[PDB]
């Protein structure tokens, strides 16, 4: 199928909220091995963010039902079996994206922006794996998430303005990793506060095109700081 036909199908699938079809189209675009445009990169991100987000939401609900059915053995067992099914689907979705990131996107990224975007995304998908991981495998998944975020962060600090939407979005997601996965609220708050304060100090330099996206991400950083400092 031509690259343009697949991208047009992904856009039709997006308008129909068919994110599994969008992911299959954008996978088939990525596996052609050409560097993605900013539009194609964003379509790939939206596709797999919605597909994984749906499974994570289902997993949290079913995990809460398994916990609340304690003492009802048959109901608890049915909730467990259904949780483990969703964890398998989530693992398959994450490993699919991680394979695309490692084979086609990170190696072919020519620009610092694209590298930080894909390394942030690598950190996000290992973080989603770490949320559902149990036993000894969890440590290796956590280390991979942390490595991908640190590599993204080192590039973003050198090559990107504090007000840049992707650098802010990296600080947001990496602060959530420190909080939810590493149980390190002081590191989460320190990172989120530093990124917010640096971006406030330079906010007057921001272009009209990036203004909406950066200010929305700065708002989310502030809301997380408020939540984690009350806890």
């Amino acid at each position: 199928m031509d690259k343009n036909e697949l991208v047009q199908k992904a856009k039709l699938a997006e308008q129909a909220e068919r994110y599994d079809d969008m992911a299959a189209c954008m996978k088939s675009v990525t596996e052609q091995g050409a560097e993605l445009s900013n539009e194609e990169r964003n379509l790939l991100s939206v596709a797999y963010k919605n597909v994984v987000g749906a499974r994570r939401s289902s997993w949290r609900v079913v995990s809460s039902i398994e916990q609340k059915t304690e003492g009802a053995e048959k109901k608890q067992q049915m909730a467990r079996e259904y949780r483990e099914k969703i964890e398998t689907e989530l693992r398959d979705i994450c490993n699919d994206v991680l394979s695309l990131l490692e084979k086609f996107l990170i190696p072919n990224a020519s620009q610092a922006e694209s590298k930080v975007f894909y390394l942030k995304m690598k950190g996000d998908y290992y973080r989603y794996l770490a949320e559902v991981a149990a036993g000894d495998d969890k440590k290796g998944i956590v280390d991979q998430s942390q490595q991908a975020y640190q590599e993204a962060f080192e590039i973003s600090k050198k090559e990107m303005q504090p007000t840049h939407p992707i650098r802010l979005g990296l600080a947001l997601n990496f602060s959530v990793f420190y909080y939810e996965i590493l149980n390190s609220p002081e590191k989460a708050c320190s990172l989120a506060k530093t990124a917010f304060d640096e971006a406030i100090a330079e906010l007057d330099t921001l272009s009209e095109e990036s203004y909406k996206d950066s200010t929305l991400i700065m708002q989310l950083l502030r809301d997380n700081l408020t939540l984690w400092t009350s806890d």
């Binding site: 996000d124 979005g169 947001l172 997601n173 959530v176 909080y179 939810e180 991400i217 989310l220 809301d223 997380n224 939540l227 984690w228």
Partner: peptide, 5 residues
């Protein structure tokens, strides 16, 4: 709940 993007 806390925000990610």
């Amino acid at each position: 709940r806390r925000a990610t993007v």
